[PDB]
Every structure is written in C-alpha cells, then in structure tokens.
C-alpha cells in the first residue's frame, strides 16, 4: 500500500524502521518519538558506523507532516545472545534545548514590559521561532529566578494567565488560550472505536 508513514533523518530515508511510535501531548512543552532499526555485523569485515548524536528527524503520516524533531537525542544499541541485535533512536521538539538549558538572560530582571516581550527574549537565545496568538498582558514587575530552566519559567508565567504552552507539528512554539477550532471526525461507537 501507499506508505501511510514515512520518516526522514537529515534527508536520507529510513527503510528499515522495524517499529515506530509517535506522541504529541498538549499538557507538556515538547513531543517525542522512538524508532527501532535493524543493524548487522559481519565478523572480520568492515562496518560503516553513523552514530549520529544530533541531526534533524522528520515523520510524515499518510503524506502529511506529523512531527519536527532536533533528532538523535538518544542512541542505544541493544544486543542479545539469542533473538537479535538492533538499535534504538529518540527525538524531541525543536525547543528541546529550552527544556534542558538554564536561562542566560542579559540582566535577569525586567523593569516594565509584557509577557510576550519577555518570552521573546528568553526563547530567542536558541533560535526557536515563536507562534503567539493569545492576548498580551502588562506586568509591572518580572524577575526570572537566577539559573532557573526555560521550561519552568515559561510554564510558571503562562499558568497565571491561562496560556497553554505546547508545540505544533512544524517546529514552533504555540501559546493559545483555547482550541484551534479544527473540526475533526465523529467518533461513533460501533463504527470505528476499538
């Protein structure tokens, strides 16, 4: 059948993904992914090793984009005396570094600004494009905790203003106060539920 799921890593297709799994959660700040790949080894013969610790990963589900790592965040090589020898991969959203980097703000305390103008100066140290659609708020005082992660502070500030903080399927950061409004399917029992 026309492949209902295709994956790319830096522009070379993965033709041996013996398994796959994708996730996208609204109650977090980054998606995820996991791919299992078959690997071989011939004793006393050459073997070509990639071991890419970092590169882009793309997943297309039925001819449609469904994820944008950046990729190869994890590399583990399982191995067995019996069944077989394989490899595993993992990935996360483009904002991965925000999730695992302590802020390096110029000074460390705003004088008088808005939340939008603060999130721009926090994220843009790592070149992650923002996707803002919520209402702006004016905050007389803001002072980011010294050394606190980017994930903590954005989540903390956006909780008190009813801003959802979650990723899109393209590699951006989307802050919204409601549903995207894209009407889906009528999941009816006895028709498609399992």
């Amino acid at each position: 059948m026309i492949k209902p799921m295709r994956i790319f890593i830096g522009g070379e297709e993965l033709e041996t993904y013996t398994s796959a799994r994708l996730q996208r959660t609204k109650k977090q700040l980054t998606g995820s992914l996991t791919v299992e790949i078959f690997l071989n080894y011939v004793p006393s013969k050459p073997v070509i090793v990639n071991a890419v610790r970092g590169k882009e990963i793309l997943v297309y589900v039925m001819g449609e984009l469904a994820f944008t790592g950046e990729g190869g965040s994890d590399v583990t090589v399982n191995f067995a005396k019996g069944q077989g020898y394989s490899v595993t991969l993992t990935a996360r959203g483009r904002t991965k570094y925000l999730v695992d980097s302590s802020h390096s703000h110029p000074t460390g305390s705003f004088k008088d600004t808005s939340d939008r103008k603060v999130i721009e100066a926090l994220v843009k140290e790592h070149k992650v494009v923002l996707d803002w659609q919520g209402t702006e708020v004016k905050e007389p005082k803001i002072t980011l905790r010294d050394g606190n992660r980017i994930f903590n502070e954005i989540f903390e500030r956006c909780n008190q203003n009813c801003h959802f903080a979650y990723e899109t399927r393209d590699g951006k950061l989307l802050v919204t106060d409601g549903t995207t409004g894209v009407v889906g399917e009528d999941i009816v029992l006895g028709q498609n539920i399992l």
Partner: protein
C-alpha cells in the same frame, strides 16, 4: 538375562515402605547433574560449569489381586498419607530414604473387577538440621 538360568526372585528385592510390604510392578529413576551452559556472541566457542547434583525421583506401580484387595489397598493408602518421610526399599536401588509426592488409584466394577492398580511418585528426602547451618 543371557541364558535361561534367570531367577527373577533372586535379583529383585521385595518392595516396602515404612515397613508395610507391598507388591511392586515397575521401577524407574531419574538422575542428572545441574549444568550452566553458556554460548557467547559472534564466537565459535562455548562454555560450561557445574552447579551440583540433581535431586532424584522414583516412580513405582503396585498391583493387588488377592481376595479382599479393597481392604489392603484402602489400608495401604493410609500409610502413604502419613506425615514425614520414611525408608523405601526400592526393588533395584536398594534401601533409600524417600517421601511420597502423589498417588493415583485406578479401579472399576465392570471393565476390571478384582484388581486394583496404584501409581506412585517418590522423591529423595535426606534429613537436615533446623538451624540452617
């Protein structure tokens, strides 16, 4: 046996258990040694290790024919169910300390009336001290 001068009553010991005699009809055993075989990966050589002796197990079959077999049969089962192990005179392995583990009694009134079969499954049981060493 080679030649016709065999006297089976002279080579097979009479069965018994806890002192009550009974008529045996078969005799088996099971012996072995615990291994730890291991085979490496991508290698053309294997290995092995020894982890001690394996526990034996004996199985016997008894037949009752004489008149009033139900009483002897129904009275022998009361000995297999007694608490603790006891001496077992294996027909071929000689005396050995064993403990019963199961017993199936087979009987009928129309298919076979006048004979009772009872299969048994014994296990070696050596006394051990209670202070764990």
């Amino acid at each position: 046996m080679a030649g016709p001068c065999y006297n089976p009553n002279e080579h097979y010991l009479p069965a018994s258990f806890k002192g009550v005699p009974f008529d045996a009809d078969s005799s088996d055993s099971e012996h072995g040694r615990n291994g730890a075989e291991a085979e490496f990966v991508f290698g053309e050589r294997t290995g092995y290790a020894d982890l001690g002796i394996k526990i034996r197990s004996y199985s016997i079959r008894a037949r009752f024919q004489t008149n009033d077999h139900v009483a002897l049969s129904n009275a022998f089962i009361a000995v297999l169910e007694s608490t603790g192990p006891g001496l077992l005179v294996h027909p071929t392995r000689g005396p050995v300390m064993a403990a019963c583990r199961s017993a199936r009694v087979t009987d009928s009134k129309v298919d076979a009336a006048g004979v009772t079969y009872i299969d048994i499954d014994f296990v070696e049981a050596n006394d051990t001290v209670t202070g764990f060493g």
